[PDB]
Amino acid sequence: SLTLFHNPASPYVRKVMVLLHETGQLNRVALQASQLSPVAPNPLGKIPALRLDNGQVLYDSRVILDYLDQQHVGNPLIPRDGSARWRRLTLAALADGIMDASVLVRYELALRAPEKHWEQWLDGQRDKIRRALAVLEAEAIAELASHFDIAAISVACALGYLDFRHPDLEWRQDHPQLAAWYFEISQRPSMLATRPPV
């Protein structure tokens, strides 16, 4: 079968796992436990990475999601053409950017020695997250609710990661519509099954 190089904490892996659940493809993929190397190091250790039967490996998560969305016969979760394609992919990119910034803040606080922390840098990354959440609340609520697709899955996983690694960034208070949407989609079997450990 397909082998997915996997880690249960990664929000980028989670996107893939949620799509697999949602599209009924989970039983087609074997999860290979894979080691994180955030400080210093599937020869490139890409996570997620998807190995096909010829030994060739696909990455990163966006490429893997694109591939997997074409292997099932249900409604596509990534629009194949038209304005909706780039709108949903931009919303997904917005979510990926929330993840990128969240991961940078996490790696700094969890892995860099305190003496080497840079507050202006950390605040700059926090600001990206705040600005992105504001856009979602102001512009994207109806859009997210319309279809649990590439955009909704990516945002959901970004929000899950914020709760997981950054509980002290309270985001529900200033984004109540996003909070209500998230509470609901959090109960989907795909989301329940893919929560990060501890």
Add this chain to the structure above:
Amino acid sequence: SLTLFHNPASPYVRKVMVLLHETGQLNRVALQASQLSPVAPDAALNQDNPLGKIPALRLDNGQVLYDSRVILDYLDQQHVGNPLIPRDGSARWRRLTLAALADGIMDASVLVRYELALRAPEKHWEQWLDGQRDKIRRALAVLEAEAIAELASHFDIAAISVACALGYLDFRHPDLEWRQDHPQLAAWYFEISQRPSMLATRPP
């Protein structure tokens, strides 16, 4: 019109500019200059891309696309020549994976630039810097070992992305040697650097 947030230093912007040049679409896209960093944001950019990153592409109706991969995907469908991103089949995912390899080199290279140029020297995290150096080297080794013929076969999304990553290494990290251990990649890069699209999009 279309408006692209732009500077000549960014290799992600460069991928877009190279595609525009290769596909004959430059005269459709206005450039809006952006100077920015995570500690010095562009407030005009932030109103369009809340992540505060370039490229971002404002469409005629004011809808904004980002990040670079989304913009490349859109622009590749706005010309009637051979696509630079395969739209069907195994080739799509191989070429996009190679592009992702290149984007990984760029991502690491940019984080290293910000560490060395912006963060105070006494706060430089040597062990992480070493890690990033190694991650870049391993990616280059994979290109050298596995992808040379593939890159030379078509100057497409994969070739453009790799080329922009190499240009960025030379630009921001000239003291990081990459040619010595990757001669086939170096030779390919020397050849495609002579393409008009590459010559026209060099960093300052």
